[PDB]
Amino acid sequence: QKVDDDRKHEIEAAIVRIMKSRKKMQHNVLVAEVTQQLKARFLPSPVVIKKRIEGLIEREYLARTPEDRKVYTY
Amino acid sequence: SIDEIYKYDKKQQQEILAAKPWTKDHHYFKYCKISALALLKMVMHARSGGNLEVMGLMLGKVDGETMIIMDSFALPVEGTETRVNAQAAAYEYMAAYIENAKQVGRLENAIGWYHSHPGYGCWLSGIDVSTQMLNQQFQEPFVAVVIDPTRTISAGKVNLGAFRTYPKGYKPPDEGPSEYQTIPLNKIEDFGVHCKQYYALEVSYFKSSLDRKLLELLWNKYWVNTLSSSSLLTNADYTTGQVFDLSEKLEQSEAQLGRGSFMLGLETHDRKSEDKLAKATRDSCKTTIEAIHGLMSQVIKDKLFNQIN
Amino acid sequence: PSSNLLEQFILLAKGTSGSALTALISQVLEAPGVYVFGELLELANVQELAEGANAAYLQLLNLFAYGTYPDYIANKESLPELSTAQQNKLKHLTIVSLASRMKCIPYSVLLKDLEMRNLRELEDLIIEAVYTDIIQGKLDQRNQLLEVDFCIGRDIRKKDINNIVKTLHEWCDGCEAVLLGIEQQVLRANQYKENHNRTQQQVEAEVTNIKKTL
Amino acid sequence: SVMACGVTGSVSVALHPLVILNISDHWIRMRSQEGRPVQVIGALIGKQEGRNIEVMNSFELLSHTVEEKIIIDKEYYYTKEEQFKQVFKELEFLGWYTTGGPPDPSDIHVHKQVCEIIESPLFLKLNPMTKHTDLPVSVFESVIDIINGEATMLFAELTYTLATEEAERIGVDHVARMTATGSGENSTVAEHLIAQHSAIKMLHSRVKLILEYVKASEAGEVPFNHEILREAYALCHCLPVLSTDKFKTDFYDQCNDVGLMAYLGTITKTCNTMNQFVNKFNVLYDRQ
Ligand SMILES: [Zn+2]
Numbered sequence: 001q002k003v004d005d006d007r008k009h010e011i012e013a014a015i016v017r018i019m020k021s022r023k024k025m026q027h028n029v030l031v032a033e034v035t036q037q038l039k040a041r042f043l044p045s046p047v048v049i050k051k052r053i054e055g056l057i058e059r060e061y062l063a064r065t066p067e068d069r070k071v072y073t074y
Numbered sequence: 075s076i077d078e079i080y081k082y083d084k085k086q087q088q089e090i091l092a093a094k095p096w097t098k099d100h101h102y103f104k105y106c107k108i109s110a111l112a113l114l115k116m117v118m119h120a121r122s123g124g125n126l127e128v129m130g131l132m133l134g135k136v137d138g139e140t141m142i143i144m145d146s147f148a149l150p151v152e153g154t155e156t157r158v159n160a161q162a163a164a165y166e167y168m169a170a171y172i173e174n175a176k177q178v179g180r181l182e183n184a185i186g187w188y189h190s191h192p193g194y195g196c197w198l199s200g201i202d203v204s205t206q207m208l209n210q211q212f213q214e215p216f217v218a219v220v221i222d223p224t225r226t227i228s229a230g231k232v233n234l235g236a237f238r239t240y241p242k243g244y245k246p247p248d249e250g251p252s253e254y255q256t257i258p259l260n261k262i263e264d265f266g267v268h269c270k271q272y273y274a275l276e277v278s279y280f281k282s283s284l285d286r287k288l289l290e291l292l293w294n295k296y297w298v299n300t301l302s303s304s305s306l307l308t309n310a311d312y313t314t315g316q317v318f319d320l321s322e323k324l325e326q327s328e329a330q331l332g333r334g335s336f337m338l339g340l341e342t343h344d345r346k347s348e349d350k351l352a353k354a355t356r357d358s359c360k361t362t363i364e365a366i367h368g369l370m371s372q373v374i375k376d377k378l379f380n381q382i383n
Numbered sequence: 384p385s386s387n388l389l390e391q392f393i394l395l396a397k398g399t400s401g402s403a404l405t406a407l408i409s410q411v412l413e414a415p416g417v418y419v420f421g422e423l424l425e426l427a428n429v430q431e432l433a434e435g436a437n438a439a440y441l442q443l444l445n446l447f448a449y450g451t452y453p454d455y456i457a458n459k460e461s462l463p464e465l466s467t468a469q470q471n472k473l474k475h476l477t478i479v480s481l482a483s484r485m486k487c488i489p490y491s492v493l494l495k496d497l498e499m500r501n502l503r504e505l506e507d508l509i510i511e512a513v514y515t516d517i518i519q520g521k522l523d524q525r526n527q528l529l530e531v532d533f534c535i536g537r538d539i540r541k542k543d544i545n546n547i548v549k550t551l552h553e554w555c556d557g558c559e560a561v562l563l564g565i566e567q568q569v570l571r572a573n574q575y576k577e578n579h580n581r582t583q584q585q586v587e588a589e590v591t592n593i594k595k596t597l
Numbered sequence: 598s599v600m601a602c603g604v605t606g607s608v609s610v611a612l613h614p615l616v617i618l619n620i621s622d623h624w625i626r627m628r629s630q631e632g633r634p635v636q637v638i639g640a641l642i643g644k645q646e647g648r649n650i651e652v653m654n655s656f657e658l659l660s661h662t663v664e665e666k667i668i669i670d671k672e673y674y675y676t677k678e679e680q681f682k683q684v685f686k687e688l689e690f691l692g693w694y695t696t697g698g699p700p701d702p703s704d705i706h707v708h709k710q711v712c713e714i715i716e717s718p719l720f721l722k723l724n725p726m727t728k729h730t731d732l733p734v735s736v737f738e739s740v741i742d743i744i745n746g747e748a749t750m751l752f753a754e755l756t757y758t759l760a761t762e763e764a765e766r767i768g769v770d771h772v773a774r775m776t777a778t779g780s781g782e783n784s785t786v787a788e789h790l791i792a793q794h795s796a797i798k799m800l801h802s803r804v805k806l807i808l809e810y811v812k813a814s815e816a817g818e819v820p821f822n823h824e825i826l827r828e829a830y831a832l833c834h835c836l837p838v839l840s841t842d843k844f845k846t847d848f849y850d851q852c853n854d855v856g857l858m859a860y861l862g863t864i865t866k867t868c869n870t871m872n873q874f875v876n877k878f879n880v881l882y883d884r885q
Contacts, residue, residue, distance in 0.1 A: 024260035026200075062260075067127040067154050071194060072260045080629035111622045114772055118615060121764035145622075151684040163683055170680050174673070179626050223764070231771050279775055281783045287621050289612060289776040292769050293792045294730065300796045305851075338885070348876060355869035359828065360778075362862025365855050367777065367789045374793055376848070377826045378561055380838045383553035386824070421821045483831060486839035536831025543830065544815060549832045551808040558801040565794045570788045 011038060011049075015063070024062065024072060079107070079142070079280055082135070082181045090136055096215055100244060105140040106217060106236035106275040110285035112146045113234065116188050119148055120221040125192035129160045131168065133175070134185035141217050141236070141275065144182045147171055186217035188234075193224035195255040195265075196235030203268045206239045209323075217275065230312060234277040248342035249273055252350050253324060254319050256355065304372035307365060316361055323354045386418030393422060400428040405440045412447065412469040418476070418517060420448045421538035439463050448538040452477040452497050475512045479534050482518055488529035599700045601740050601751040610736045610757035611651040614769055616641065616694070617734065619655045620723045624696045634696070634725060636669065639708065640674060641692040641719060642681065650719065651760060652691055656681070660707075667703055669693075669710050692719025698726070700737070700752055708751060709750060712739055720752060730795065 015034050024030060031053075035044035057063040060073040096102040112132065122128055130148040134141065149164040156162075172183070187209060191197070198206060198218055210215035218237045225232040240246065251274065257265045279285060293300075309312060327350045334343040392407050411417055423429060423444065432441045443462045446454050452473050455462060465473070474497055481488055481496065490502065499505040509529065512518055520531035539547065623637040638660045643653040656677065659670035678690065693711045695704055700722065711718040717739065724733035737752035744760075761769075777788055807829055814820065 026260065026264045029263070065127070070199075070261075071127070071192065071258075074258050074260055077625065080626060082630070109622075110772060110776075111618055113775070114615070114618055114768065117768040117771065118765065121768060124764075148684060167680060167683060170676070173849075174657075174659070174677060174680075176658050177673070179623075179630055203624055225772055226767050231774055278780060279778075280775075281780055283625055284618060284621055285772065285776045286788070288614065288618065288769055289773045289788055289792075291617065291732070292773045294732070294795060296761075296766065297770070297773065298792055298796060298799065348872065351872055352869060355865050358865040359862055362859055362865070363785060364739055366859050366862075367786060369852065369855050370786065371789060371793055373852075374561065375796075376563070378557070378797070382557040382836065383550060419824060422823050425820050429748060460670065475696070483834035487841055514744045534748075534831065536827045536829075536834065539826055539830045540821060544811065547811060547830055547833055548808070548815075550836065551804060553809065554833075554836065555801070555808065558797060558804065561607055561797055562794060562801065565790045565797070569787050569790050572790070576784065 007042070010041075014038060019062070028068065040054070076280075076282055079282065080144075084181060091214070094214065100240055101249070101273070102239055103136075103141050103215065103217070104276060106143065106219075106277045107140055107280055108143045108219075108234065108236075108277060109145070110279065110282060110288060112143045112286065113279070114284075115146045116219065116221055116234065117223070117226065119146070120190035120192075121223040121226070125224050126191060127190060129187065129189035131184055132186040132188055132217070133180065133182040135182055136185070136215060138218055139255060141185060141215065142197050143185055143217075143219070145175075145180060146188060171293055184213055185215070186219060188219035188221065192223045193222065193228070193258075194213055194261045195225070195257050196220040196222055196233065197255065197265050198237050198239070198268065198272050200262050200268050203239055203271050204270065206237065207242070210239055210241070217326070218272075230306075237272045238275060239272045246270060246273065248346050248347045250349075251353065252323060253353070254322065298331075300371055300375060304376070305365075305368050307368055313361060313365075316357065320354050320358055323350060327351055327354070385414075385418070388414065389417055389419075389422055393426060396423070396426045396428045399433060401435075404428055404432065405437065408440050408444055409463075412443070412472060413466055415468060415472070415515065415532065417472075418479075418535050419538060420444065422539055424448055424538065424540055447473060447476065448540070451480055456498060471508070471511070474508060475515075475517055476537065478509070478512060479518065480537060482520070482529075482531035482534035483536060486520075486531050488531060490527035493529065599702070599705055601742060601753040604751075604753040606753065606755040606757075607738065608648045608650055608724055609757070610755050611643075611649070612709050612721075612734070612736070612757055612759035613643075613651075613653050613759075613761060614765060616652055616655040616721075617723070619657075620694055620696065620721075621725070624723070624725050631669065638669065639694050640677075640690065640695055641721065642685075642688045642811055643691050644687060645689060645691060652719070652721075654685075654688060655694060667707050668731055669707060671697055671710065671714060674714070690715055690718075692721065694721040694723065696723050696725055698724055705750065705752075708739060708752075712750075719755075730798070 011034075014037055017039040018033060018037055019030055022030075023035065031044075031046065032048060034049065035046075038044065054064060054069060057066055057069065062074060065071045065073075114135075116130070116132075119128055119130060120126075128148065128151075130146050132143045133145040134143040136142065149160065149167055150162050151160050152162050155333055163279070166238065168184075175181070187205070189202070189334070197220065202218055202220075206216065209218070216238075218239075220235040222229075222232045253274075255265075271275040330343065331347050334340060334347065389411070392411060395407060396404060408423070411423065421528070429441065429444070432438070435441075436591070439462060442458070443455075443465075446458065446462065450458075455465070455473055465559065477497060478488075478493070481492065490505065493499060493505050494510075497505070497506075497508075506522075513520070517535055518531050519533040520529065522529055537543075609728040619639065622639070623639055624634065627635040627637050637657070639655055639657040641652050641655050644651045658677075659673040660667050661670065661817055681688065693707065695707070697704070704720070704722070706722050708718065711720075720737040720739070722735055722737070727733035735821075736755040738755055740751050740753045741748050742751050743749075779785055810818070810822075811826070812830070814822070814826065
């Protein structure tokens with residue numbers, strides 16, 4: 001469980017650190033970069049990352065906006 | 075006659091809908107006339123609670139190359155569109171409203187759809203392009219109106235962009251407005267991809283009775299105090315941005331004109347380059363008249379208060 | 384509480400007067416807060432004093448209502464000797480008149496009209512007047528100017544009414560002149576719109592005639 | 598007489614520009630459809646918090662004239678109420694509106710039906726044929742008075758306010774700016790000058806009241822209203838706002854800057870006309 005949590009926050013650190021120095025997407029563009037940079041770590045797990053990226057909308061830090069998930073907090 | 079536009083001629087509308095002149099030209103519809111009532115209602119709906127992504131239907135009619143919007147209204151959205159599209163219990167509401175209006179008087183039918191773009195500009199996204207293309211299949215004509223509540227504060231005014239799509243496969247012959255809009259990084263990608271798949275109509279407001287009513291109310295209650303300095307235009311971000319945008323537009327016009335002199339027999343370039351020059355001049359003229367009106371109110375009041383006697 | 388005290392003195396003046404009324408006037412001129420003396424002047428007992436033998440106090444009250452500090456200095460013999468509070472109040476009234484007439488007051492005028500020999504005393508009196516909510520403004524020491532944004536007014540009972548009526552009439556005439564000017568410009572704009580319109584249908588009539596020709 | 602005398606407002610009414618716009622649209626369309634300015638009837642909705650009533654929205658009602666009596670289609674009204682329940686539930690029915698001048702012996706019956714519908718309805722009447730500079734909108738409440746031994750329903754004028762939000766303020770200000778712009782350009786300075794004309798008229802009316810009061814005080818009234826005439830004289834002395842060299846320096850500075858901007862705008866318009874002339878001339882006789 002400890003190492004799983006380690007991976008689960010390392011992936012968040014990677015996604016934020018990379019997408020802060022890069023641009024964004026509209027539907028499916030950024031997922032490719034994070035899978036490429038996590039390719040050497042483990043499997044991309046598209047469903048898990050897709051379900052997790054939409055959980056930050058209740059906050060900010062480039063969210064997605066509850067009314068329509070396309071306008072992020074840039 | 076200011077109120078002539080409010081007259082509804084059902085047979086004339088049926089005749090136009092049977093004629094279908096828009097099938098003869100994909101640039102047939104060029105103008106969009108919006109009632110002060112519909113503008114206010116759409117801007118008020120768009121503002122709603124700060125910056126909410128909302129949408130509605132527009133009631134109106136057609137007159138030659140002009141699409142006329144008389145009224146507007148919204149649709150139920152339980153759980154902020156928890157189902158597909160912002161419709162949910164849409165059909166029922168729409169039909170009820172239509173019949174109710176036909177009884178109380180409103181005989182204008184569906185002429186289009188409006189939706190808001192909170193702080194990202196007036197344009198059509200891939201979804202909106204497909205929606206207006208389907209709105210060109212069923213309900214033959216239709217127009218997509220886009221509002222910006224957050225830019226009504228940022229830019230200060232903002233226009234209600236009116237748009238129509240091109241059919242699948244069809245290329246704009248030369249249509250190139252070269253109009254610049256500030257689009258967020260997470261939105262400019264999609265914007266540039268589907269930008270040529272539609273065109274913008276010229277939006278105009280007949281000087282009716284609803285409009286001057288609002289103007290009077292505001293300048294008789296809230297804007298009755300014509301002091302507030304005299305020029306909020308002094309903050310050089312809106313004018314300077316328009317000035318800088320005007321400079322870029324004409325600079326690109328010269329670059330195209332210089333390259334177009336070597337090609338002998340390119341009619342498309344001529345029309346488009348002169349179109350750019352004309353559009354850029356109007357933007358400067360509208361900015362100029364706004365500043366002139368600003369000083370005129372300034373001069374009359376300032377001269378009076380200081381040295382009347 | 385200046386207004387309440389002045390109203391109480393008015394009510395008392397309807398009765399007791401004479402030597403007591405002079406004491407009340409002295410208290411008014413010594414008690415801070417009363418910047419307006421037009422309320423007292425209209426009392427019938429002030430007129431009784433006018434027909435009364437005693438006149439030094441009534442002349443002092445008249446000068447406080449209408450005159451300024453130089454008038455009191457000239458009348459230093461015919462007026463009762465003032466106290467520190469009375470002198471400060473009269474100087475405040477003089478500064479009020481100067482500010483009302485003209486808003487940006489040079490230090491030279493302040494020194495001349497108030498017997499101010501030391502500019503430090505002038506600054507002290509100015510700040511004392513401002514801090515008692517009499518005059519609102521700003522001081523420019525480099526230019527030796529006193530910019531007064533707002534000031535209180537003076538008493539008006541006998542002769543300034545005609546000037547006020549003349550000033551009000553001039554303002555009314557000026558407002559009407561601007562109203563007529565705005566109407567003329569609106570008519571001119573309508574004529575220009577009509578001329579622009581008149582130029583329009585001529586073009587369409589010119590176009591339609593050629594269309595019929597061909 | 599359908600108006601109550603000596604009755605003061607018991608509740609506070611807040612009105613929004615949307616209601617006024619809806620009433621205006623109903624009146625305009627009914628005039629266009631049937632010639633003369635046919636009277637319109639609608640309903641008012643909004644939020645009520647105790648004695649504080651806020652009218653945020655309004656809609657229209659179907660009415661029919663039978664036996665020279667206006668019968669409100671209350672079934673239509675309830676159907677549309679349920680229809681609004683699908684979009685907005687926080688808004689509750691508050692009253693009904695109509696157009697006209699003084700109350701007529703036909704609005705009393707309509708208000709009677711509306712009071713039959715709900716507990717306490719509000720009555721609003723708009724005058725589209727007004728000529729004064731005041732707002733031709735009045736809010737009336739239902740009051741029961743014993744006239745000649747019979748309980749007769751009367752209307753009591755309510756001292757209503759007009760409440761708005763930042764959003765509506767910005768939107769209506771934008772619509773005013775649009776009304777400044779004309780069709781191509783129908784009237785641009787006309788509204789601007791009338792706008793300052795109303796403001797000057799408002800101040801001009803205030804000066805008349807002060808001038809009349811001084812004239813009356815010279816003859817009768819209170820000989821001296823104390824702090825009022827004292828201050829009124831002080832404001833006639835503050836009337837000539839003293840200007841120094843720097844203010845006239847800055848005032849001329851601002852006039853020259855935008856005046857140059859106005860000159861640039863004229864040049865931009867002139868060259869476009871020249872460009873249009875050149876383009877037309879190059880087709881008139883010239884080739885290539
Ligand atoms: Zn959109």
